[PDB]
């Protein structure tokens, strides 16, 4: 696993019930800023009007690069 | 997998925007009417408005019986 920060790309959409989560569409480029545990990342991306959207999401939904 | 048809219960919400995907909330009981391939089921349920809806969804998001 590469040291943070690092770029990942969503391989699937992630849409969940929890407010702490980052949600996104497939292909979304995300910056991982914290590895939360063995299975979850915390990271961010900028929405339409340039606002930073951040939260946690499964490592298994993204690929590193 | 048993022989179709069989009942599954959603273990996570599935909220895809793909046309022809079935969407549901966690805990939704669904009848699987066909196995589409190694990763997708096709099935249906009667929604909270009394309407039968159907489409494909991940085998991974549900549990049999």
């Amino acid at each position: 696993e590469p040291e943070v920060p690092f770029k990942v790309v969503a391989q699937f959409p992630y849409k969940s019930d929890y407010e702490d989560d980052l949600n996104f569409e497939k292909d979304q480029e995300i910056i991982v800023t914290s590895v939360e545990d063995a299975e979850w990342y915390f990271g961010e991306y900028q929405d339409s009007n340039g606002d930073v959207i951040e939260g946690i999401f499964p490592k298994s939904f993204v690929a590193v690069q | 997998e048993p022989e179709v048809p069989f009942k599954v219960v959603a273990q996570f919400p599935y909220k895809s925007d793909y046309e022809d995907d079935l969407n549901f909330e966690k805990d939704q009981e669904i009848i699987v009417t066909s196995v589409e391939d190694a990763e997708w089921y096709f099935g249906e349920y009667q929604d909270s408005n009394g309407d039968v809806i159907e489409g494909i969804f991940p085998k991974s998001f549900v549990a049999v019986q």
Binding site: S16, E39, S60 | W40
Partner: peptide, 11 residues
């Protein structure tokens, strides 16, 4: 179709 998403991990 393409690949289905994996089952999300426990929170």
């Amino acid at each position: 179709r393409g690949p289905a998403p994996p089952p999300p991990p426990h929170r």
